[PDB]
Amino acid sequence: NLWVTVYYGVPVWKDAETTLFCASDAKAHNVWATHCCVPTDPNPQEIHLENVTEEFNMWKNNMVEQMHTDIISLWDQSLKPCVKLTPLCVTLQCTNVTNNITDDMRGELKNCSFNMTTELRDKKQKVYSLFYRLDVVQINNKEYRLINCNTSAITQACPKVSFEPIPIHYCAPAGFAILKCKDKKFNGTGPCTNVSTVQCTHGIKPVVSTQLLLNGSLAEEEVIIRSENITNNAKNILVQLNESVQINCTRPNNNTRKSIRIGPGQWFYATGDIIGDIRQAHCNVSKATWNETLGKVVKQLRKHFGNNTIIRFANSSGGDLEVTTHSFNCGGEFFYCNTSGLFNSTWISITLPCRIKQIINMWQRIGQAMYAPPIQGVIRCVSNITGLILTRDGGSTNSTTETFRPGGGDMRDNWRSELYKYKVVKIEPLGVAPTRCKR
Amino acid sequence: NLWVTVYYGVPVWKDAETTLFCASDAKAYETKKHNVWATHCCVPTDPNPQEIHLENVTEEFNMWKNNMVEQMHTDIISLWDQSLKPCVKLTPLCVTLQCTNVTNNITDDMRGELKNCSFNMTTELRDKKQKVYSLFYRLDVVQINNKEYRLINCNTSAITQACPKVSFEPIPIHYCAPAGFAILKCKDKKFNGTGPCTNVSTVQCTHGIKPVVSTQLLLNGSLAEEEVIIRSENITNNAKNILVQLNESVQINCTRPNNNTRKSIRIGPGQWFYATGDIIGDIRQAHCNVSKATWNETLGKVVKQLRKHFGNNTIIRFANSSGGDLEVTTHSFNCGGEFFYCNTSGLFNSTWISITLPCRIKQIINMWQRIGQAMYAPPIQGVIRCVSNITGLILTRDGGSTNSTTETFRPGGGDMRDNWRSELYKYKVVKIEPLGVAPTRCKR
Amino acid sequence: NLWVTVYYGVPVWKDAETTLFCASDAKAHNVWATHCCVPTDPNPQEIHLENVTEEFNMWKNNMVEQMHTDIISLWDQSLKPCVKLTPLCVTLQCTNVTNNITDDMRGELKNCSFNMTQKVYSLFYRLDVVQINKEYRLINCNTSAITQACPKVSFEPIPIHYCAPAGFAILKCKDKKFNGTGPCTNVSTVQCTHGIKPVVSTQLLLNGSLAEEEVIIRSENITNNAKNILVQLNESVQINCTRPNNNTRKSIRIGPGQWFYATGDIIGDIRQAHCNVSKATWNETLGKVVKQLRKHFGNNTIIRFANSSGGDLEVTTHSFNCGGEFFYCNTSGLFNSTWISITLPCRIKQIINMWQRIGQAMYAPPIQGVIRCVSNITGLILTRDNSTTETFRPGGGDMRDNWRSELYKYKVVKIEPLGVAPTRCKR
Amino acid sequence: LGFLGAAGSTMGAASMTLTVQARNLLSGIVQQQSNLLRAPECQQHLLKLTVWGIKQLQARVLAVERYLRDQQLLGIWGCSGKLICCTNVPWNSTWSNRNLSEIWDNMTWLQWDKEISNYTQIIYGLLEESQNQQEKNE
Amino acid sequence: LGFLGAAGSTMGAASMTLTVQARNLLSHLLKLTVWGIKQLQARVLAVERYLRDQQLLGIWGCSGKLICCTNVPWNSTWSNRNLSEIWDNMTWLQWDKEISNYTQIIYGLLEESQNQQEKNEQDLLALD
Amino acid sequence: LGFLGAAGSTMGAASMTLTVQARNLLSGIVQQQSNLLRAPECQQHLLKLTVWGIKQLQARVLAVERYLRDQQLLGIWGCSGKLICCTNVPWNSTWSNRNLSEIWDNMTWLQWDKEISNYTQIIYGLLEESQNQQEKNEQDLLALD
Numbered sequence A: 001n002l003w004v005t006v007y008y009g010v011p012v013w014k015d016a017e018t019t020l021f022c023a024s025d026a027k028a029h030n031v032w033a034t035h036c037c038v039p040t041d042p043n044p045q046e047i048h049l050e051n052v053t054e055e056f057n058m059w060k061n062n063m064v065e066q067m068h069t070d071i072i073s074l075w076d077q078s079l080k081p082c083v084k085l086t087p088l089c090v091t092l093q094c095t096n097v098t099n100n101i102t103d104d105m106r107g108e109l110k111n112c113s114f115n116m117t118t119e120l121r122d123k124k125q126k127v128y129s130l131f132y133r134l135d136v137v138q139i140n141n142k143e144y145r146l147i148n149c150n151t152s153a154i155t156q157a158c159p160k161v162s163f164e165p166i167p168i169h170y171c172a173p174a175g176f177a178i179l180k181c182k183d184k185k186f187n188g189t190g191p192c193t194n195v196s197t198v199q200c201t202h203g204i205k206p207v208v209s210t211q212l213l214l215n216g217s218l219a220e221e222e223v224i225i226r227s228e229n230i231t232n233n234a235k236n237i238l239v240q241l242n243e244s245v246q247i248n249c250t251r252p253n254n255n256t257r258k259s260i261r262i263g264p265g266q267w268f269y270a271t272g273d274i275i276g277d278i279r280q281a282h283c284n285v286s287k288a289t290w291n292e293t294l295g296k297v298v299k300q301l302r303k304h305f306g307n308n309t310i311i312r313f314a315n316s317s318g319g320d321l322e323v324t325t326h327s328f329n330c331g332g333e334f335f336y337c338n339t340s341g342l343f344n345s346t347w348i349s350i351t352l353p354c355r356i357k358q359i360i361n362m363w364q365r366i367g368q369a370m371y372a373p374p375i376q377g378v379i380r381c382v383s384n385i386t387g388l389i390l391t392r393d394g395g396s397t398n399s400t401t402e403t404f405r406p407g408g409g410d411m412r413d414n415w416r417s418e419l420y421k422y423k424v425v426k427i428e429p430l431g432v433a434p435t436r437c438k439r
Numbered sequence B: 001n002l003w004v005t006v007y008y009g010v011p012v013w014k015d016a017e018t019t020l021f022c023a024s025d026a027k028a029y030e031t032k033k034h035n036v037w038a039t040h041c042c043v044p045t046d047p048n049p050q051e052i053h054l055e056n057v058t059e060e061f062n063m064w065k066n067n068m069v070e071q072m073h074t075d076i077i078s079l080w081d082q083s084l085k086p087c088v089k090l091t092p093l094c095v096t097l098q099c100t101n102v103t104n105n106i107t108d109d110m111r112g113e114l115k116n117c118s119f120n121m122t123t124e125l126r127d128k129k130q131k132v133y134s135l136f137y138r139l140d141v142v143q144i145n146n147k148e149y150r151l152i153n154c155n156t157s158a159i160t161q162a163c164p165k166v167s168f169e170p171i172p173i174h175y176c177a178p179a180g181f182a183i184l185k186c187k188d189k190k191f192n193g194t195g196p197c198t199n200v201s202t203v204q205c206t207h208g209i210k211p212v213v214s215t216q217l218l219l220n221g222s223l224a225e226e227e228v229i230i231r232s233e234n235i236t237n238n239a240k241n242i243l244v245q246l247n248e249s250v251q252i253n254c255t256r257p258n259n260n261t262r263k264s265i266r267i268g269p270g271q272w273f274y275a276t277g278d279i280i281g282d283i284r285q286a287h288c289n290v291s292k293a294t295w296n297e298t299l300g301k302v303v304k305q306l307r308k309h310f311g312n313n314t315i316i317r318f319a320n321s322s323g324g325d326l327e328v329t330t331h332s333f334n335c336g337g338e339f340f341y342c343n344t345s346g347l348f349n350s351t352w353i354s355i356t357l358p359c360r361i362k363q364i365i366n367m368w369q370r371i372g373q374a375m376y377a378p379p380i381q382g383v384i385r386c387v388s389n390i391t392g393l394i395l396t397r398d399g400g401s402t403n404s405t406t407e408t409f410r411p412g413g414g415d416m417r418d419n420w421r422s423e424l425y426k427y428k429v430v431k432i433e434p435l436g437v438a439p440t441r442c443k444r
Numbered sequence C: 001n002l003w004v005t006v007y008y009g010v011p012v013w014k015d016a017e018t019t020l021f022c023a024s025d026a027k028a029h030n031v032w033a034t035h036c037c038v039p040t041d042p043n044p045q046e047i048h049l050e051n052v053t054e055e056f057n058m059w060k061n062n063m064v065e066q067m068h069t070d071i072i073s074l075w076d077q078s079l080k081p082c083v084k085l086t087p088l089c090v091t092l093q094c095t096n097v098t099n100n101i102t103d104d105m106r107g108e109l110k111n112c113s114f115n116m117t118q119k120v121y122s123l124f125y126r127l128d129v130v131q132i133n134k135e136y137r138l139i140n141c142n143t144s145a146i147t148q149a150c151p152k153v154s155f156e157p158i159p160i161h162y163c164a165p166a167g168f169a170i171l172k173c174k175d176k177k178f179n180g181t182g183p184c185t186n187v188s189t190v191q192c193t194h195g196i197k198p199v200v201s202t203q204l205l206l207n208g209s210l211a212e213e214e215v216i217i218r219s220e221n222i223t224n225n226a227k228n229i230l231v232q233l234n235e236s237v238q239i240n241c242t243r244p245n246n247n248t249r250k251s252i253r254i255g256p257g258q259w260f261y262a263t264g265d266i267i268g269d270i271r272q273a274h275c276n277v278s279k280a281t282w283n284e285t286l287g288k289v290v291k292q293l294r295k296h297f298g299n300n301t302i303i304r305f306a307n308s309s310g311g312d313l314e315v316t317t318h319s320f321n322c323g324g325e326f327f328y329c330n331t332s333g334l335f336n337s338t339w340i341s342i343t344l345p346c347r348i349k350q351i352i353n354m355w356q357r358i359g360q361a362m363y364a365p366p367i368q369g370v371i372r373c374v375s376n377i378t379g380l381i382l383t384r385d386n387s388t389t390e391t392f393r394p395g396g397g398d399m400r401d402n403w404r405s406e407l408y409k410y411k412v413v414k415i416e417p418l419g420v421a422p423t424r425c426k427r
Numbered sequence D: 001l002g003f004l005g006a007a008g009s010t011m012g013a014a015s016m017t018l019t020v021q022a023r024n025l026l027s028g029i030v031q032q033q034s035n036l037l038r039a040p041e042c043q044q045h046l047l048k049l050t051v052w053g054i055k056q057l058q059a060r061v062l063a064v065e066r067y068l069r070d071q072q073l074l075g076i077w078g079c080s081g082k083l084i085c086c087t088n089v090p091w092n093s094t095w096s097n098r099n100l101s102e103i104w105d106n107m108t109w110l111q112w113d114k115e116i117s118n119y120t121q122i123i124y125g126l127l128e129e130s131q132n133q134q135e136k137n138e
Numbered sequence E: 001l002g003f004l005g006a007a008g009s010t011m012g013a014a015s016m017t018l019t020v021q022a023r024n025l026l027s028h029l030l031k032l033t034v035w036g037i038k039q040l041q042a043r044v045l046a047v048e049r050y051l052r053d054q055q056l057l058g059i060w061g062c063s064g065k066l067i068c069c070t071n072v073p074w075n076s077t078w079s080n081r082n083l084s085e086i087w088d089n090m091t092w093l094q095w096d097k098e099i100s101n102y103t104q105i106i107y108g109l110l111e112e113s114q115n116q117q118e119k120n121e122q123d124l125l126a127l128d
Numbered sequence F: 001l002g003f004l005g006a007a008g009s010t011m012g013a014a015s016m017t018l019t020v021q022a023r024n025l026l027s028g029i030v031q032q033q034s035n036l037l038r039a040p041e042c043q044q045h046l047l048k049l050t051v052w053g054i055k056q057l058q059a060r061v062l063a064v065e066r067y068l069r070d071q072q073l074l075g076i077w078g079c080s081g082k083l084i085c086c087t088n089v090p091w092n093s094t095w096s097n098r099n100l101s102e103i104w105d106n107m108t109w110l111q112w113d114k115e116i117s118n119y120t121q122i123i124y125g126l127l128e129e130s131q132n133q134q135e136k137n138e139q140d141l142l143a144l145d
């Protein structure tokens, strides 16, 4: 004669989507967190769930999709109120820069002049600036248009806006919780033990890059190879290193900036002359570290690919620079570095040249582009690689040897690499059970 | 062997920073449908509010840190800007102007005050540019180096024309606490603006305040009760403005005597500009009248109270403003939809131990001391007269030698937050925390 | 000694007005796709309400007004960021396009050359230009905000559903042969409306619901000659429409970052656009309408169908926008008889004063290739003009009347769970 | 019968099933927000920071306030936690002079509500006064 | 323990954390910016789900309690398991899975039972 | 004496009007809805001004949250529906060491709240635990019959 008993506050949960919000360290005009508002606890709480086993799947993680949306929306919010550059989509007259310029930059840096209006609609001014070849398109000889004149609206990024990544902590609203795997050597697709509950995630820096990751977390103890399905060549492989690789990047030229008033108080920023000589942009990767790093990676790949098999690294297929090169942003400047000097080995201080571009159609979309204003002086940045994004070739012929190349580029992968340890669940406090009682 | 007891509805509060809601008398809305202050802040107040006297309750107030003031300031800016967002922009008028002098029936005082400007406008076919003309006040036109001029804001911002259908005429506005909050007010006579207040009362809503905008002299506020009160954040500094609240108002009569008309200029497809048209009759100066004896008496009272912080054997001198732009050097009020900048040197000129103030009119207004936004005030047809109550002075104390034995005061200020402080200084917002515990002698 | 008892969960409601939300199917680049993103219920349900008499008034139904407001807003949002055509207001130098044409199209198209900030030319329809002083200007050149629709946007109607927000319910009238007003006795509660295609037309209502086993004639006031009469047919009439000429499209640079899409030369011969209505079907359809009209005019009253009246083109001819182009068809051949394969010539124009507003217009870029449309005539909009003979004409132009064609059986009510009643029971 | 299935039944018959109507509002709110949250991702619309997004949020808040208004009022009258509560306010013949058999049978709740619509505020005021008196008594 | 620390505990032991688990259900310039909107929406969502559960408890009776008892008997159909097998050597998560597809049945029964009880207290008060 | 008129009274005397404050706070939602009937649909003007509106909306949401938090605590502590309740939690001399008459008279509630501010969370945790134990004991009694 057991009867129904009802409880409230029962410690159970179900997989769920929720609305997430930002929290920060308080201490940190920077686009990623102008109104994050919520401070995190200086000492985040975490509860160990002993005797709990839970299922995680990083490839179906709704948190990744939400981060993607929040990043895009904030990006657009930043540019929405900034000056349009439509008046610059005019015939431009260009010659090469030959003044104490090295061979690597011949034909890359251009000196261009044009007719643009002043503050009054009745008057024009003759102005000039320097441009990089990548953003200048030839008409039919010395005449050029902006690369995206017939393609997209160009919005100038506002000055005094920082793009520097700020760790963002995602927090769940009351009624929801975030579960995390502390289980070591976890590849993100199966059950994990050592599960804990938190209210907020660790801070994640919204770093944007392509072929190689930058400033992420390191794996503990071993290199972890993660993919949805290893067998399917269409899937990308996210490799998380347990040691960083140091990379030193620079824009060696001492630049200047001009500011041209146009229209009713609007301003256009443009590259001025270069002080000193003109040199090519580049990145240094410690050589010994890089070699050792690949050996560590290969050793883990062999678990799925064979002991007597040959693992090769090679450069990527052609396509847009955000596919074929290593893209990153330092101080707000946009670099496109050649990685063929890294992925060139067979298993059984490296200098990489870089290009600079200013008109950029970020997030793989057409119709909008940002114009990145120049930064005066000399740019230097040092980063931690902490992981690679690789893809594999066919392997159907002579399946003793397989080649991996830098690849992917889908921006989602840069988040999956940090969010794979987290899951959102909802708390469901009500439940029933039989017992001995009556009213 | 006492036990914990729990109570709800306990009369306890804590200081708090929250958002108040805006409310009005309601009747004003039905009367003036185009008033921004009635359209928004539409929620009615009770027709019969109460004040609850708190017996034997002492609280400290600090008007200089009052969050209610900061909210009022922000709400005003926000409403103002939204009102202009959908209005016709005047970007197409940032053109080269060709200007000559208006010399027709001009009195001596205005010889060169008004200009007759023309320019080439292209709204039809983007061709056949049409020469058009309008009149401008000297203050809004800058010479480019003989007859070549531009509008003053072409190197700063686009100018948005204010919509003719939007009225900004101040009406009383009340701030009201949301449930869970209460507003305490200080009733003490001769209140300093800071520190303990003996007579404290709880209210739901503040008295109505008209959001009147002015510089160097407060208009249409509350009068002090039975005393002239001089208050400031730091009376011994010179870095602070001094708010003087008068116990009697001084009447001021302002006019723009010239009879104006308008020219409607079509800029684009529903895009219209309202230009100053021809002026009917003779041209004479805009001005404000102040009664001389009343003004003297007013200063004498201020000085008598001012001496409390300076001593009896000292010279108190009033002087005119320091240099700077019009927003701070002249008195500045909007009368009948036109912006006036009046010379107050005729008021603050005396030594203690029918006054006519000439005025100028400007149409391009850069408001709230911001840079990068601008408004164009369309002209108003006919003649404009305003009769207002001066209710408080804004003074600044100058610097000086170690022992000059003389203090000098000037009609300074200009930060709008202070005008709001002069009305909100009596109010404080607290939150109610009705739940709490105490020891007792009972058990379940 | 009766006492007041308070009951919560009482099944009552009141007429109320709120904002309904839009739901769509899985298949929904279309103008409605952003707005209607909520999936519809995979298996919609209704609850029949036994012994409930409700009251409807289709002429005062705030579902209609909402649909109207929402559609206008979306069209404007879509066009808001697109290229403005102000730079093209410059005077055009035009020829008569008589190369390989039929006589019925003579002078209908014009080959216009003009200058830009460069010598360029394009073809225009006669109805979009005005002859001035070979000199032509756009018909609203210097008066309106003529903008170009972005070619990427699809305006193809997709059925949409309006759904009640929680706390609200939609009541549906199922009475057969319902008048559109007054008491209704067959009422069910629904989650959402049926899918409705937001089809825009004048004179003849296209692709709506059919009546069941009768032609139903509804109006706000049947004798008031100032009111329109909506006629809902129980059978569709098929109409085939076409623009047989094979077109092409070119782009030109009108300003920095600004391109205009122009009509290029026509491939093949030029002939007139038209619509085909089966003759026998149409004659039977009119007869059915007359049989029903007589109910309000008399058993032996003579009824005449007249062609049209004066007014703007959009309301004197039949109008529709199939394929993305705008057709203005002469329906006089459909309303020319007295009771007691019909080819309709069609004109095409690109500058549209959609929604009958003044000072605004949309320019429709041309469609390359050939347009062939098939559609269902489901109802008519008629206006009534010695008692022996009554005369009726096609009407339209007030879009509320079209939305009302489908939204006449639904009303929105608010649920109010508290109430009181007396009982023999004290605390 | 369904959510409004009892709408055409008599007041007496409809005194039963009160649980479904009471349950339907919050169930509907949660289900609609859940359906949207996991919907093919269109919330970018909400995040356009436009008026549409604000109206959607305002609707949610007002629905909650209406719900709480009723619960708060039941608390005021001392009926919290019950779907059916008796009070100490006597029925006025002015509000209605019909007898109990006359109204509980052969009449729906919709009809009843129309009949006494004009006394709603009066009754609610009286119910509050009655509860205040009991708080003073205890 | 703390929030969900009882997840690994048996159903019986876990009853000692009902209070803490309940405590976590409801935990000046502001402009329209992305982070601002998301926080406000998140607050609203938490409230909406909270209320749904509180009302459901109100309907069933047991308002204000963490632990209660009703008059609906347990059906062997839902689960023919012993108390020594349910309240021990089993967690609440496991239990929820075991009877997951009977949730609505139970709830309907609870609602009807309270409805009948309310009618019966109304009848007794009507006695005199 | 109206809302908070008891603020200057000592704790004992002040408790006589807990009802007055509770009624003003516990009717807050109901009153706001009434105000929306006084000026029906004027809110449509407010809905077009998004910054003003977001601030006012935030205020409405917070008012609801405050309401629910107070009710939740009274619920979990077993004081639902009451303004005054006793619970089975002994008082610690650490929190306050003055005599009963010393606390209840000659001191206002504002003064008292300051005196024990640092013990509020401790006490609340104890109130919570005691109620949970009581609910289990009720279940035992029902089972015993």
Ligand SMILES: *[C@@H]1O[C@H](CO)[C@@H](O[C@@H]2O[C@H](CO)[C@@H](O[C@@H]3O[C@H](CO[C@H]4O[C@H](CO[C@H]5O[C@H](CO)[C@@H](O)[C@H](O)[C@@H]5O)[C@@H](O)[C@H](O[C@@H]5O[C@H](CO)[C@@H](O)[C@H](O)[C@@H]5O)[C@@H]4O)[C@@H](O)[C@H](O[C@H]4O[C@H](CO)[C@@H](O)[C@H](O)[C@@H]4O[C@H]4O[C@H](CO)[C@@H](O)[C@H](O)[C@@H]4O[C@H]4O[C@H](CO)[C@@H](O)[C@H](O)[C@@H]4O)[C@@H]3O)[C@H](O)[C@H]2NC(C)=O)[C@H](O)[C@H]1NC(C)=O
Binding pocket: B034, B167, B169, B212, B213, B219, B220, B333, B334, B335, B336, B337, B380, B381, B382, B383, B385, B386, B387, B388, B389
């Ligand atoms: C501090 O506080 C003070 C307040 O004390 C502030 O000063 C105030 O400022 C406001 C804002 O400008 C101002 O309000 C204006 O008042 C104008 C006139 O008000 C008068 O009308 C009433 C009633 O008239 C009606 O009823 C009588 C019956 O009794 C009829 O006979 C009459 O025909 C009509 O139907 C009079 O009672 C009143 O009498 C006054 O008494 C005062 C005593 O102290 C005295 O001082 C006054 O001089 C006066 O004698 C006035 O005559 C009013 O016109 C303003 O409204 C105009 O602008 C709004 C903008 O939205 C328009 O909507 C409106 O139609 C008005 O516009 C007209 O004019 C323009 C061109 O100028 C035209 O294009 C329009 O179509 C309108 O047409 C008018 O003129 C036509 C031509 O004659 C006529 O045919 C039309 O019928 C129209 O009249 C506005 O409401 C306060 O009056 C003013 N108060 C005082 C006192 O000064 C001060 O600013 C504050 N501090 C600061 C500086 O911030």
Ligand SMILES: *[C@@H]1O[C@H](CO)[C@@H](O[C@@H]2O[C@H](CO)[C@@H](O[C@@H]3O[C@H](CO[C@H]4O[C@H](CO)[C@@H](O)[C@H](O)[C@@H]4O)[C@@H](O)[C@H](O[C@H]4O[C@H](CO)[C@@H](O)[C@H](O)[C@@H]4O[C@H]4O[C@H](CO)[C@@H](O)[C@H](O)[C@@H]4O)[C@@H]3O)[C@H](O)[C@H]2NC(C)=O)[C@H](O)[C@H]1NC(C)=O
Binding pocket: A162, A164, A165, A207, A208, A214, A215, A328, A329, A330, A331, A332, A375, A376, A377, A380, A381, A382, A383, A384
């Ligand atoms: C992986 O992680 C690494 C480590 O954090 C990160 O590298 C760091 O990148 C940031 C951003 O590029 C670097 O920050 C800059 O540092 C210089 C340092 O200046 C030196 O000299 C000054 C002399 O006065 C000293 O005070 C100072 O301590 C240093 O010795 C700063 O000058 C930069 O400030 C400007 O940019 C800021 C952008 O946020 C502005 O907020 C700031 O106001 C400055 O801009 C304005 O003033 C300038 C005046 O010179 C003017 O030129 C500008 O136009 C403007 O008006 C800035 O703080 C940081 O040093 C790097 N750390 C290391 C070790 O190299 C990697 O970028 C990251 N990788 C990825 C992919 O994200």
Ligand SMILES: *[C@@H]1O[C@H](CO)[C@@H](O[C@@H]2O[C@H](CO)[C@@H](O)[C@H](O)[C@H]2NC(C)=O)[C@H](O)[C@H]1NC(C)=O
Binding pocket: C050, C051, D005, D006, D008, D009, D010, D013
């Ligand atoms: C609508 O009215 C009919 C009667 O015309 C109701 O049907 C009766 O219901 C009672 C139970 O309440 C049965 O004992 C009778 O035998 C039924 N009569 C017939 C002829 O079948 C019907 O229940 C009413 N609808 C609603 C929703 O109450």
Ligand SMILES: *[C@@H]1O[C@H](CO)[C@@H](O[C@@H]2O[C@H](CO)[C@@H](O)[C@H](O)[C@H]2NC(C)=O)[C@H](O)[C@H]1NC(C)=O
Binding pocket: A050, A051, E005, E006, E007, E008, E009, E010, E013
């Ligand atoms: C996880 O399971 C272990 C048993 O393997 C539980 O540990 C027991 O706890 C009781 C408490 O009364 C002790 O008497 C036993 O000696 C412990 N067993 C062992 C082997 O140490 C543990 O409590 C469970 N976790 C949770 C959250 O309940």
Ligand SMILES: *[C@@H]1O[C@H](CO)[C@@H](O)[C@H](O)[C@H]1NC(C)=O
Binding pocket: A091, A093, A113, A114, A115, A126
């Ligand atoms: C500016 O316009 C003139 C027109 O005569 C042209 O000759 C000149 O080359 C243009 N200059 C530039 C920098 O485009």
Ligand SMILES: *[C@@H]1O[C@H](CO)[C@@H](O)[C@H](O)[C@H]1NC(C)=O
Binding pocket: A186, A187, A188, A189, A190, A191, A227, A228, A229, A230
């Ligand atoms: C590693 O990934 C594969 C493929 O997704 C999966 O089958 C395997 O279970 C994962 N390893 C662990 C420990 O979960």
Ligand SMILES: *[C@@H]1O[C@H](CO)[C@@H](O)[C@H](O)[C@H]1NC(C)=O
Binding pocket: B187, B188, B189, B190, B198, B199
């Ligand atoms: C405070 O109120 C009392 C009683 O009305 C009055 O006598 C006293 O003068 C007031 N004090 C001040 C500073 O106004």
Ligand SMILES: *[C@@H]1O[C@H](CO)[C@@H](O)[C@H](O)[C@H]1NC(C)=O
Binding pocket: B192, B194, B195, B196, B232, B233, B234, B235, B236
């Ligand atoms: C009055 O205000 C002045 C302002 O500087 C301050 O110094 C003084 O201490 C205040 N006096 C009292 C009694 O609060």
Ligand SMILES: *[C@@H]1O[C@H](CO)[C@@H](O)[C@H](O)[C@H]1NC(C)=O
Binding pocket: C179, C181, C182, C183, C219, C220, C221, C222, C223
């Ligand atoms: C149908 O509508 C007409 C409109 O004039 C009205 O006169 C008639 O009474 C209505 N019929 C019914 C059954 O409601």
Ligand SMILES: *[C@@H]1O[C@H](CO)[C@@H](O)[C@H](O)[C@H]1NC(C)=O
Binding pocket: C221, C222, C223, C224, C225
């Ligand atoms: C309906 O229209 C007729 C005109 O034919 C008019 O006489 C009659 O009064 C109208 N009905 C109403 C609603 O008054």
